[PDB]
């Protein structure tokens, strides 16, 4: 698409299924999901920041955009993944 996340998708696949590979045609589809979600989360976080007269996209603005754009428990566990992630330095 625009940016390649193939190696990072390779990373997580070995964590989830170490003995199951992914095709190159499917990796392109995986790379498109990440590129689409990245620009949606970062795009809404910038709208949230620009709105409140903010000059900083922080983790709370990313957390809000994740809550508004991911449906159901997708956002529930993603926010848990995010808050746990920044909880290390």
């Amino acid at each position: 698409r625009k940016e390649s996340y193939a190696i990072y998708v390779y990373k997580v696949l070995k964590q989830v299924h170490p003995d199951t590979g992914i095709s190159s045609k499917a990796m392109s589809i995986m790379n498109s999901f990440v590129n689409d979600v990245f620009e949606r989360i970062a795009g809404e976080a910038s709208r949230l920041a620009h709105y409140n007269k903010r000059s900083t996209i922080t983790s709370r603005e990313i957390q809000t955009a994740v809550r508004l754009l991911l449906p159901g428990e997708l956002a529930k566990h993603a926010v848990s993944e995010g808050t746990k992630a920044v909880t290390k330095y």
């Binding site: 990373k11 299924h17 199951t20 095709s23 000059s55 900083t56 996209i57 997708l74 993944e81 995010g82």
Partner: protein, 77 residues
Amino acid sequence: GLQFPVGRVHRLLRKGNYAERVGAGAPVYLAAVLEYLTAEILELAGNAARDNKKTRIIPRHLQLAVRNDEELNKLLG
């Protein structure tokens, strides 16, 4: 220990012209969110793979896993 690099996600946020500056925890939060969603897809896709005895995820297992998981379907429809 993230598989998605906080570094590049920070650079992708700076060159993206989203705001003036980017908080330190923002690429960390986004990298974990990006890593969680792919792990969610790759698991259901990897399941459908070996549920067909396939030792390799092909575009079909990606299409099936997201489509009939209506949370992922409403997200990546």
